[PDB]
């Protein structure tokens, strides 16, 4: 859909084509994360540390339970009906999450039947069988630390030293816990909390958490880096200091009519200086519509772009016309840096600004020259089978576009400045010119 | 080159002058990082943990080896020639890196002659002598943990507890490893990967890695914070689970004709409110050209600005004229915050907005007043040798500019709004005014 030949002439060389994929239709599993360690077998060497810990931790978890209660207390079976009046104010995400929270409670109530097994857990990871068909896992914070560094050290270190080490381990745990489950978690209802954040409750060990839950392996690692695997806090127990988290495992699906095209920026010659075109590097095409995307929030791999939501955004008509061949509307920024891409390879064809990068032909021994009327030179099979740029020798293929690519030329658009300060300056200076024009026409209208 | 006297009058007080430095001409050393620990002396207490680990780790490293093979399989001795057709699509950075990768292979092949010594390594750090003249270091992940917390705990903790602790240590390692060597590493070829990221393969202990390699101490710490020290993955061994990394150690060189000037923003009076000029805080001057810089990616020290590449960017003509004395073109934003710098010290001269900050003279007992026709007052030796702002008493020097600094005055430029939403709003409202002007002139042309 993009006019790749005219675009490469202005420094935008066709790059890799990737599929557009978005997470959908998740499977769910519940996991129990206990934030308080089991110190039963070092009970004489805890002092008042656990008492201070429980108090401090309650001050972290209570605001979460409260936030969840607002939705739980106002959601009933009809088919789930919410008391919109009692909730008062909510976003769409919170509202749908409020229902998910309510429905999730029904299984949390089954998990809670094992409350005594959850409290009794003394291993970092315990698999509890509810009814054989139903299995829930319990993860315990700092339990491995205690089982290996405090319990077996009973006659290695003093009892008071053991107590101090416990206190510090607990304090360090909270220091990191607070970045996720602290005051920043103004909304524990919305199911958008990435699993790598939730896992801080278990030392940040999300790999253990996920393996524990089994998951599906079709594209597991892409799901994690794209933040598609998330969880929701369903239940908070402030007497036992554990939470129940529902972990969502979405499947990335392909959009049959959508792809993202990467362009490779190449500095090009104009007048007597280097220029770089300011056009989106990643262009999203869906059916017949060319649009933008906030790809900065997506995972980019060799075959696809993996997003945890739809990040498509609007594109202006002037940029769309730029992309379809009206290059007189493609904006360009001056290159002043000594470090800019000056060439790119695409499908065996080499595009280079042979004015700023030294170009020589390996097969003929002759230099490759560029006139002031040319932007980039296209080097292939027909001119130089093997070309040299700087100290790199490249064996080339053939260009499948116009054989007159280097002769036809191209229209060049207006200069721009992308710097934040420059943006404010440019808007202001244009307003001064605009007001002058307004005064001039008003004078003409009064005269006429 | 900058008109510092007119600039200080509009809230831009000359600050610290720093040298412009960029990393270049690196030396290289190869280091081996083994991601799999040696558990030979606890082999009865590993269960199936190492088998699961090897499988999971292979799923992380295989995509890296594959990405490297694309360049390695297509690069040959001529003097290095690349199969541009087979590579198909690449950026300039990848292409030059592809050559570096190929050349690096020649030493990786020597390192690999010690494959059995690499596998046998059971210490966190081992120095291996290849030929006395050639030395390679091997770093092993979690080896110190195992040697101190699992091996010596054989009759301290149970064998199964030891196994569980190993499994968790391995899982935590991968949890962090995945942020660097996971799906996000779409390009392991380009030699732009910061050493602090690579070191995650060794627990994030980059200080050990670097000391191990010796390095040069001229400005080592500046090189690290500026991300000038980087590495490239040269070889991946999926049977032994180790990688060979080439670490680049560049030398920061001074640009003989380039410096960066910092300006210190000071709120100033205009009409009956506070204003702050929106001019770049860090201005890059090279020879006779005034330009911008993305200094947000550079390290700033007392004497120099250290960059890992050239970050110079264009500046508009209106901003350049602002900086050289045409202050009628310097944009200003309204100050509404109660917390803005209201004064600055430069070369012993105090510049203050004595309308918004209370100014008193320590040597005379009299207040320092400012008229509505003045922006900032310049306070020095001639008016008040020691001046007081708020609760701070400052002994001052002498201003070397015009003695009539406080009498001459200055031109003030147009108002701006820098907020992202305000930028979109300002562009739109200007288009409505622009279309009205277009209609008015078209009507005049039809009438005439």
């Amino acid at each position, epitope marked *: 859909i993009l006019h790749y030949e005219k675009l490469s002439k202005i420094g935008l060389v066709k790059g890799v084509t990737r599929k557009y994929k978005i997470k959908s239709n998740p499977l769910t599993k519940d996991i129990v994360i206990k934030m308080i360690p*089991n110190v*039963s*077998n070092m009970s004489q060497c805890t002092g008042s540390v656990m008492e201070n810990y429980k108090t401090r931790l309650n001050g972290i978890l209570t605001p979460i339970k409260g936030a969840l209660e607002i939705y739980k207390n106002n959601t009933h079976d009809l088919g789930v009906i919410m008391a919109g009046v009692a909730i008062g104010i909510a976003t769409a995400a919170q509202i749908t999450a409020g229902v998910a929270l309510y429905e999730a409670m029904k299984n949390a109530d089954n998990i809670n*039947k*094992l409350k*005594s*097994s*959850i409290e*009794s*857990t*003394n*291993e970092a*990871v*315990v*698999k*509890l*069988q*509810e*009814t*054989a068909e139903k299995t829930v896992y*319990v993860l315990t914070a700092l339990q491995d630390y205690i*089982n290996t560094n405090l*319990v077996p050290t009973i006659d290695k270190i003093s009892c008071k030293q053991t107590e101090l080490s416990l206190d510090l381990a607990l304090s360090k745990y909270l220091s990191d816990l607070l970045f996720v489950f602290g005051p920043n978690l103004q909304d524990p209802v919305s199911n958008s909390m990435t699993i790598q954040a939730i896992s801080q409750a278990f030392g940040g060990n999300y790999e253990t958490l996920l393996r524990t839950l089994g998951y599906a392996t079709e594209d597991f690692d892409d799901l994690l880096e794209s933040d598609s695997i998330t969880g929701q806090i369903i239940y908070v127990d402030l007497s036992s200091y554990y939470i129940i988290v529902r972990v969502y495992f979405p499947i990335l699906t392909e959009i049959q009519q959508a792809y993202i095209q990467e362009l490779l920026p190449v500095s090009f010659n104009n007048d007597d200086s280097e220029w770089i075109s300011i056009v989106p590097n990643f262009i999203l095409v869906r059916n017949t519509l060319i649009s933008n995307i906030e790809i900065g929030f997506c995972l980019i791999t060799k075959r696809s772009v993996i997003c945890n939501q739809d990040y498509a955004t609007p594109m202006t008509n002037n940029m769309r016309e730029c992309l379809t061949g009206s290059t007189e509307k493609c904006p360009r920024e001056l290159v002043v840096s000594s470090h800019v891409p000056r060439f790119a390879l695409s499908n065996g064809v080499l595009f280079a600004n042979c004015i700023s990068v030294t170009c020589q032909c390996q097969t003929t021994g002759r230099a490759i020259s560029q006139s002031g009327e040319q932007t980039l030179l296209m080097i292939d099979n027909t001119t130089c089978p093997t070309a040299v740029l700087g100290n790199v020798i490249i064996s080339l293929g053939k260009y499948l576009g116009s054989v007159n690519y280097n002769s036809e030329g191209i229209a060049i658009g207006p200069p721009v400045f992308t710097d934040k300060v420059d943006i404010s300056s440019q808007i202001s200076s244009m307003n001064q010119s605009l007001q002058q024009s307004k005064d001039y026409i008003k004078e003409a209208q009064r005269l006429l | 080159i900058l008109h510092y006297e007119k600039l200080s009058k509009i809230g831009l007080v000359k600050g610290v002058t720093r040298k412009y430095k960029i990393k270049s001409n690196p030396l290289t050393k190869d280091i081996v990082i083994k991601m799999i620990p040696n558990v030979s002396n606890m082999s*009865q*207490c590993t*269960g199936s943990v190492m088998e699961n680990y090897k499988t999971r780790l292979n799923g992380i490293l295989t995509p890296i080896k594959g990405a490297l093979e694309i360049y390695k399989n297509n690069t040959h001795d001529l003097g290095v020639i690349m199969a541009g057709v087979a590579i198909g699509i690449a950026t300039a950075a990848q292409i030059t890196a592809g050559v570096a990768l190929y050349e690096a292979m020649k030493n990786a092949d020597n390192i690999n002659k010690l494959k059995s010594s690499i596998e046998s390594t059971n210490e966190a750090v081992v120095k291996l002598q290849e030929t006395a003249e050639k030395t390679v270091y091997v770093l092993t992940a979690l080896q110190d943990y195992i040697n101190t917390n699992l091996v010596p705990t*054989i*009759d301290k*903790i*149970s*064998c*199964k*507890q030891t196994e*569980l602790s190993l499994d968790l240590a391995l899982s935590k390692y991968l949890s962090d490893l995945l942020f660097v060597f996971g799906p996000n590493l779409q390009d392991p070829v380009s030699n732009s990967m910061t050493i602090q990221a690579i070191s995650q393969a060794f627990g994030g202990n980059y200080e050990t890695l670097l000391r191990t390699l010796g390095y040069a101490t001229e400005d080592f710490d500046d090189l690290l914070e500026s991300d000038s020290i980087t590495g490239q993955i040269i070889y991946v061994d999926l049977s032994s689970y180790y990688i060979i990394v080439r670490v680049y150690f560049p030398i920061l060189t001074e640009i003989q004709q380039a410096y960066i000037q910092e300006l210190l923003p000071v709120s100033f009076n205009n009409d009956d409110s506070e204003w702050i000029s929106i001019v770049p805080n860090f201005i890059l001057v090279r020879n006779t050209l005034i330009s911008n810089i993305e200094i947000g990616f550079c390290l700033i020290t007392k004497r120099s600005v250290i960059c890992n590449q050239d970050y110079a960017t264009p500046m508009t003509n209106n901003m350049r004229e602002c900086l050289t004395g045409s202050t009628e073109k310097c944009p200003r934003e309204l100050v509404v915050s109660s917390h803005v710098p209201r004064f600055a010290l430069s070369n012993g001269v105090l510049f203050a907005n004595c309308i918004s900050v209370t100014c008193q003279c320590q040597t005379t007992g009299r207040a320092i007043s400012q008229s509505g026709e003045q922006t900032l007052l310049m306070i020095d030796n001639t008016t008040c040798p020691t001046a007081v702002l708020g609760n701070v008493i400052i002994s001052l020097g002498k201003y070397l500019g015009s003695v009539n600094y406080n009498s001459e005055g200055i031109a003030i430029g147009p108002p701006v709004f820098t907020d992202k939403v305000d930028i979109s709003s300002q562009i739109s409202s200007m288009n409505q005014s622009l279309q009205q002007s277009k209609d008015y002139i078209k009507e005049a042309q039809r009438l005439l």
Partner: antibody, heavy 117, light 105 residues
Framework: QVQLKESGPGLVAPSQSLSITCTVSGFSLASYGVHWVRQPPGKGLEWLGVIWTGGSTNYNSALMSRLSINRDNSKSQVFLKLNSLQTDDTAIYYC?????????????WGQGTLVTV | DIQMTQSPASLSASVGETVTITCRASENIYSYLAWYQHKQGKSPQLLVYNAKSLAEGVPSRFSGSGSGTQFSLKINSLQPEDFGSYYCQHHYGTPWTFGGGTKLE
């Protein structure tokens, strides 16, 4: 106090499965592991397999293809199963609790249930 | 798996005499060895764990020692109630295993 009590079938034919349930009290199955041991008429004690505190299991090599262990953390029970019996599987089967964090020393044993094949 | 050899197969000793039982492992099991006293009609009683420590409730006439591959159990004053089959168990690697046992009259 701590107790373990085995309950299961007496005479079971060859080629039939065996299912013995150990009901426990005085401790949580989330805190301690449970091991199964048998005593054949003229042999020594034979360790069969274990279900660990963590809910995972291990078996000896001889019975690895026939022996399975499971749990119920709601009813405080541990389940010993053999998929197919031989006449030499005649033995008294015992349920025993391990010591804390997977340490050996079967301080606590059940009563023992005699299985005839 | 890890095999264990326990001997003598059968012992005869009078009341008040010192009685010892020897057990060796086919591999290195560090201090991971337990001893049991098993009477017929009853479940086995734990006597010693980690090759030396008595189980709570076990009479102090019992003691033991050992390391790696060579271990032993000692009774410093045999009582009438000490008749029974004694078992040597390792609990290092997996599976845990028992020896043939010693029958003490």
């Amino acid at each position: 106090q701590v107790q373990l009590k085995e309950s299961g079938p007496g005479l079971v034919a060859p080629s039939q499965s065996l299912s013995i349930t150990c009901t426990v009290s005085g401790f949580s199955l989330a805190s301690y592991g449970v091991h199964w041991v048998r005593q054949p008429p003229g042999k020594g004690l034979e360790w069969l397999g274990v279900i660990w505190t963590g809910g995972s299991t291990n078996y000896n090599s001889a019975l690895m293809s026939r022996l399975s262990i499971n749990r119920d953390n709601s009813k405080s029970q541990v389940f010993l199963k053999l998929n197919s019996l031989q006449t030499d599987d005649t033995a008294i089967y015992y349920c025993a609790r391990d010591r804390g964090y997977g340490y050996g020393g079967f301080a606590y044993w059940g009563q023992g249930t005699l299985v005839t094949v | 798996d890890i095999q264990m050899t326990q001997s003598p197969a059968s012992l005869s000793a009078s009341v008040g005499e010192t009685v010892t039982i020897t057990c060796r492992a086919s591999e290195n099991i560090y201090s991971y060895l337990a001893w049991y006293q098993h009477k017929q009609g009853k479940s086995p009683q734990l006597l010693v764990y980690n090759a030396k420590s008595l189980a709570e409730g076990v009479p102090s006439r019992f003691s033991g020692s050992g390391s790696g591959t060579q271990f032993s159990l000692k009774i410093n004053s045999l009582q009438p109630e000490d008749f029974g089959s004694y078992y040597c168990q390792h609990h290092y690697g997996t599976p845990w295993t028992f020896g043939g046992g010693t029958k003490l009259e």
